[PDB]
Amino acid sequence: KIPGYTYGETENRAPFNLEDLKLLKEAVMFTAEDEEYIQKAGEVLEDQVEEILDTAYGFVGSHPHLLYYFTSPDGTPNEKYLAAVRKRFSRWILDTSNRSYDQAWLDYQYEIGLRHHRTKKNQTDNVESVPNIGYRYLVAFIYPITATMKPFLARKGHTPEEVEKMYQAWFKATTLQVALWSYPYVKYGDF
Amino acid sequence: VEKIPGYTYGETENRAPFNLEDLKLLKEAVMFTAEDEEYIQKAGEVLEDQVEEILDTAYGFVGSHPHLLYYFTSPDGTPNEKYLAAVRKRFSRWILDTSNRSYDQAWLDYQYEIGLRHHRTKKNQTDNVESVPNIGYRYLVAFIYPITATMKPFLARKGHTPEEVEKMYQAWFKATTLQVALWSYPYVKYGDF
Ligand code: HEM
Ligand code: HEM
Ligand SMILES: [C-]#N
Ligand SMILES: [C-]#N
Secondary structure, eight states: OTTTTOOOOOSSSSOOOOOHHHHHHHHOOOOOHHHHHHHHHHHHHHGHHHHHHHHHHHHHHHHHHHHHGBOTTTTTHHHHHHHHHHHHHHHHHHHHSSSOOOOHHHHHHHHHHHHHHHTTTTTTTTOOOOOOOHHHHHHHHHHHHHHHHHHHTTTOOOOOOHHHHHHHHHHHHHHHHHHTEEEEEGOOOOO | OOOOOOOOOOOOOOOSSHHHHHHHHHHHTTTTTTHHHHHHHHHHHHHGGGGHHHHHHHHHHHHHHHHHGGHHHHHHSSBBBHHHHHHHHHHHHHHHHHHOOSSSHHHHHHHHHHHHHHHHTTTTTTTTTTOOSSOHHHHHHHHHHHHHHHHHHHHHOOOOOOHHHHHHHHHHHHHHHHHHHHHHHGGOOOOOO
C-alpha cells in the first residue's frame, strides 16, 4: 500500500456522474478499443516505471516554475513531498491502464483534481508548499505526460502501428482525466 | 482581401490577462521550442490546401454527437447552420494562424478573445446568434484530442518523411494544448489559473 493513496476510499462522490463520463469519453474519442489498448500500454509500461518517473520528474526538475509546485517556502524542492507524490504517480500509471473507468474511478478523478487545486494541495502529505497549481499547467502537462510515455511504449518490440494505438489510447485517457480535474478549478456552472 | 466575418485578430479591445512571460513559461510546460516553430509552419504548408476536408472531418465529428452539436443549436434545439458556417470560416483561419502567426502579444490577445467566445462572456455575440450560453470547459479540454487527431492523416499528404510528419503532428499537439490552456482563463476561479 501507498501513503496518501485512497482510490476506492474517498469521502466524497464526484460532482460529475457516469453519464457525464460517457459523454466526455465520446468527446475524446475513447471507446472499448482504447480500453483494450490502454491495458496493453500498461503491460508495456509497468516494468519501466522507474525510468518513466525519472523522465517525467527530470522535465519538472529542469524548469524552476514547474519544480516550484513541489517547493518548500524557502524555494527549495521538498524531497519528502516529491518522493510521496512519485509513488502515487507510479500507481496512477497502472490505474489508468488497469481500472474500469467506473464510479470509483470517477470519484478518485475528483480527488486528484482537488489535490492539485488549492482545495486539498499539501494536505495528503502534510507538507508546507505552494497553495495552488495553476490550472494552465495541468492542461499544459497533457503534452509532457503523453510525450514521456511514447518512447517507452516501443521498448517491448511492438510495431509502430501497435505503439500508435497504445499511445493514442494514453493521449485520450490523459486528456479525459485532465478534463475532469478542471472541475474544482472552474467557476460553478461553467464546467 | 475580404474580411472574415467576426474575425478580429489584432484588433481586440482588451489586453489579455496573461503576458509574454506567462506565454514563455507555458510554452516551456508544453515542451514547445524553436524546433516546433519550424514544424508548425511546415504543418501549415501541408494543411492549408486541405482545409475543406479537415473542416468536414472535424465538423463531421461534432455533428455526429448531439451533445457536441448542441453548442451550435438554436434555443429550440435545432442546429443553427448560419452559426456553424460562420464559425467554420474562423476555425479555418485559426488553422493558418496557429501555423503562421508569431505567438506575440497580439496572438495572446486573440487567445483571450477566443476563450471568451467559447465562454458565456462572449459566446453568441460574434455572429449575433441565439444559442446555448456557455460551452462547458470539460469539452474544450476534451477537444484537444479530436482536433489533434483530425490533423494527423492530413499531415502525411505532401510526402514528407514519417519523421517530419511525426514532428509536424507533435508541434500541432503542443500548440493546440497551449491554446486550450490559455482559453481556460475566463472559466477558472479567479487566482487559480
Ligand atoms: C497531465 C497532467 C498531470 C497528471 C496526469 C498528473 C498526475 C498526478 C498524480 C497521479 C498525482 C498523485 C495523485 C494522488 O494523490 O493519488 C499528482 C499529484 C501532484 N502533482 Fe500532478 N499531474 C499533472 C499535472 C501536474 C502539474 C502541471 C504539476 C506542477 C508541477 C503537478 C504537480 C503535482 C503536485 C505538486 C502533486 C501533489 C499534490 C498534493 O499536494 O496532493 N502535476 N499528479
Ligand atoms: C481543441 C479545442 C477547440 C479548438 C481548437 C476550437 C477552435 C475554435 C475556433 C478557432 C473558433 C473561432 C475563433 C474566432 O472567433 O476567431 C471557435 C469557436 C467556437 N467553437 Fe471551438 N474550439 C475548441 C473547442 C470547442 C468545443 C468543445 C466546442 C463545442 C462544440 C466548440 C464549439 C465552438 C462554438 C459554438 C464556437 C463559436 C463561439 C462563439 O459564439 O463565438 N469549440 N472554436
Ligand atoms: C504530477 N506529477
Ligand atoms: C470548435 N469549433
